[PDB]
């Protein structure tokens, strides 16, 4: 029901509310979207 951000590019500033949910590159793979291998959806 409730989702939490696990994968984020950088840490938040105090009282920042950043709610973009775009799937993006974590590792070596040059992609956005294309979830799998080394690109992931940010929340669980």
């Amino acid at each position: 029901n409730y989702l939490y951000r696990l994968f984020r590019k950088s840490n938040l500033k105090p009282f920042e509310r950043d709610i973009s949910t775009e799937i993006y590159q974590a590792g070596s793979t040059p992609c956005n979207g294309v979830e799998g291998f080394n690109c992931y959806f940010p929340l669980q």
């Binding site: 974590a26 590792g27 080394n38």
Partner: protein
């Protein structure tokens, strides 16, 4: 060659440089999982064994 089902693959690695980043980044694995943080973040860290 890997440990049979009657043995666990337990191969001590010591006194060396650990390229944790390539293990994560490489496409040769079918899947990768880690308990803590990705090997690219562990890439410049020191461990016991």
């Amino acid at each position: 060659r890997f440990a049979s089902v009657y043995a666990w693959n337990r191969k001590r690695i010591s006194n060396c440089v650990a390229d944790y980043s390539v293990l994560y980044n490489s496409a040769s694995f079918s899947t990768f999982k880690c308990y803590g943080v990705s090997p690219t973040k562990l890439n410049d860290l020191c461990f016991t064994n």
